[PDB]
Amino acid sequence: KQGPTSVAYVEVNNNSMLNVGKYTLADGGGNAFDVAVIFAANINYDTGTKTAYLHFNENVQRVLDNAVTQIRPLQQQGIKVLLSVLGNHQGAGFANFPSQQAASAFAKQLSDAVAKYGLDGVDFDDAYAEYGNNGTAQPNDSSFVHLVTALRANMPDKIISLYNIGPAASRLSYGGVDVSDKFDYAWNPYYGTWQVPGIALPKAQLSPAAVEIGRTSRSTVADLARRTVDEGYGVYLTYNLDGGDRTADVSAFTRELYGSEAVRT
Secondary structure (H helix, E strand, C coil): CCCCEEEEEEECCCCCHHHHHHEEECCCCCECCCEEEEEEEEEEEECCCCEEEEECCHHHHHHHHCHHHHCHHHHHCCCEEEEEEEECCCCCCCCCCCCHHHHHHHHHHHHHHHHHCCCCEEEEECCCCCCCHHHCCCCCCCHHHHHHHHHHHHCCCCEEEEECCHHHHCCCEECCEECHHHCCEEECCCCCEECCCCCCCCHHHEECEEEEECCECHHHHHHHHHHHHHCCCCEEEEECCCCCCCHHHHHHHHHHHCCCCEEEC
């Protein structure tokens, strides 16, 4: 199998992670999906102590707790598994940490989660944070730079990704550090569209196409996958794969990226 790295965000609160490893190429080429993303843990806020924390919904906690049965089968098969973190209407967000050490503390909660659950990295989705709630600050210039510098510093061997969205995505430089090269991948967050992320990252690390498996049409999936190769980009963001027979949707993109169709167990 040779071509763009395909990614699949899975809505764990209502779908199994295990569905990602059930699609492989008909040409004996491998998994249709290279990266699977646990969606999602949240950035919450403790108003009384004025500090953000890495929050996990119980349904999310369960995937973690049961990692051997939920995540491991993917990794065993060659699929990398990332945990994504989203704003949670708490005011606290990735472009919000008031100091280096504040960002750094959260940075550790992210690296530890990755260490105890055997994950392959973290993904950042800056949306819904609702900056300003619970008396928090609006987005500032340093926060994100501080948090990514620390995350990268903590886990130099893992993947660190982000959706190209929110205050954080345009707050990559501060001090003498631009955190863009600290990222492995960056993707378009608007499903059904082509929008090349404006971060200083090689084309192979960018995913201008974002699609929703099951909402976005097949001609659109196939055409956006055709365009990823046509333009020289190396990633392909897929979102919301579930437990139904999505072979046709998958083949639509595997045909263009890899020249093969996909079969499902």
